[PDB]
Amino acid sequence: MTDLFSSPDHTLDALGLRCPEPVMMVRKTVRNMQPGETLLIIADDPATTRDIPGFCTFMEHELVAKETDGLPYRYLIRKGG
Template sequence: MSVTDYDAELDASGLFCPEPVMMLHTGINAVEPGQVLRVVATDPSTTRDIPRFCQFLGHELISHAEQGEQFVYLIRRGE
């Protein structure tokens, strides 16, 4: 999957824990099961929180990359 293959984007830049994950709850529900949400964040705690969010709620973390001071995630919504 290329970094441009996603259905919606959530920009949580400038927000700190727990706000990015709280927004992710809403953002993941805005896409259909099987669709991909791209999340951009600047809080380093998302490197721990977002993978756990996906694991506990049954979503697939497709990729995670650091781009400068941003953390970029591609998440496929589970059923």
């Protein structure tokens, strides 16, 4: 397993954030992100592990690396389409 969470191009705190707030931060970040880039995202909210990423997948983004080894969760997402 290689480390894909390397220094990402962007970040999204979602610890204490809850849908749609977190999924929302990735949205605006997705709007300011570029295809071929990366965004690390943390989330302690239980609805972010499912909504934040479920959102990136819906906008044509990529989940570069997920983290569920125990809250807070984390997920990298390479902006793209």
